[PDB]
Write a structure and sequence with these properties.
It is classed as antibiotic inhibitor. The structure is a homodimer. By secondary structure, the first copy, chain A, is α/β, with parallel strands linked by helices. The first copy, chain A, contains two helices and eight strands.
Chain lengths: 119, 119
């Protein structure tokens, strides 16, 4: 079926790939400049962006899930730090100003993945 | 169901919205700092990025469609230029180096939308 997937930057496909495999994602494809991961219907696509600054990055995306808790349980179990400085880190699910519950995830490359709880 | 959606920038929600509406997309949600457009199962999300350079931007995403042809018929019929310079523009479907047929669409902020045929 029709569907739009994001394109996120990676300073090293190996690390990226390694980091997402621990969450349930795997490799659907991997070229020298393009890699695709996937966990269930969640599919993310990366591209090489060597000249990127993880601290000045504005890249992000949403992961609207049916069970944010479970998925957050995993991020913790895989050892992602629950700090408020540096990357990668996670912030527990908090009721957002817009009425939705959303947890934050910052991948190895400073990309922000807004974890939202599907309604 | 669990999905992944892109986070694209928007120098002006009005101009953006206008642009996408012509492609069958319609607003699902609109706030002051966040907009969500939808079309069937496709769903993009936008954010305010006034200090963005449409020429130096690296933002993009994939629209894996069941009928790339028709979707491209819309982009054409609504007047999008098929040039190779300037934005917004489009590039006819070309068999990609990875064995897939993909057409390229660039919106008013220089964001690349890879129109790929679903296998």
């Amino acid at each position: 079926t029709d569907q739009a997937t994001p394109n996120l930057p990676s300073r090293d496909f190996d690390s990226t790939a390694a980091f997402y495999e621990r969450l349930g994602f795997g490799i659907v494809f991997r070229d020298a400049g393009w890699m695709i991961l996937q966990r269930g219907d969640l599919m993310l696509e990366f591209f090489a962006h060597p000249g990127l600054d993880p601290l000045a990055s504005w890249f992000s995306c949403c992961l609207r899930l049916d069970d944010l808790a479970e998925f957050y349980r995993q991020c913790k179990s895989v050892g992602i730090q629950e700090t408020s400085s540096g990357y990668p880190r996670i912030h527990a699910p908090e009721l957002q100003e817009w009425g939705g519950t959303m947890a934050a995830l910052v991948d190895p490359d400073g990309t922000l993945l807004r974890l939202i709880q599907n309604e």
